[PDB]
């Protein structure tokens, strides 16, 4: 990335305090609620008729954990997101048909979830580093699209 040692340390340090289980479920659910059109990919999950129905849907929470899991692992290859997400990039394009703009929406949702959770701790400079990360991830994931 174009992350500063200081930017890398801030990312890394906050992440260490994250419950991926909880943040993953919340991030994905918020996505489905704020940007309802993203539900187009999760018809099989069930009832996403209400915020409550989305936030409570176990399938949402479980997919949320899977996605953040994968994200979490990419934070260890911050200097080669491209290579880390290559296979996932193909899958998303060729099998899932997910428009890369979704990656960007989630990224922003993720940042709102972190601010939500960390309050004070999530400072302007920490947000700035995360914004670089989420953009980086979105790009990596979109890289293999053709």
């Amino acid at each position: 990335m174009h992350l500063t040692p200081e930017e890398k340390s801030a990312v890394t340090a906050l992440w260490g305090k994250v419950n991926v289980d909880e943040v993953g479920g919340e991030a994905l659910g918020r996505l489905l609620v704020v940007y309802p059109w993203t539900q187009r990919f999760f018809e099989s999950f069930g009832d996403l008729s209400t915020p409550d129905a989305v936030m409570g849907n176990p399938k949402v929470k479980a997919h949320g954990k899977k996605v953040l899991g994968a994200f979490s692992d990419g934070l260890a290859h911050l200097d080669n997101l491209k290579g880390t997400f290559a296979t996932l990039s193909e899958l998303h394009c060729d099998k899932l048909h997910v428009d890369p703009e979704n990656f960007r929406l989630l990224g922003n949702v993720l940042v709102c979830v972190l601010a939500h959770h960390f309050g004070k701790e999530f400072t302007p400079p920490v947000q700035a580093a995360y914004q670089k990360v989420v953009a980086g991830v979105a790009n990596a994931l979109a890289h293999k699209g053709h």
Binding site: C112, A115, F118, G119, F122
Partner: peptide, 9 residues
Amino acid sequence: LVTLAAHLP
């Protein structure tokens, strides 16, 4: 949004 989230948990 980020600012409100950080302040209105």
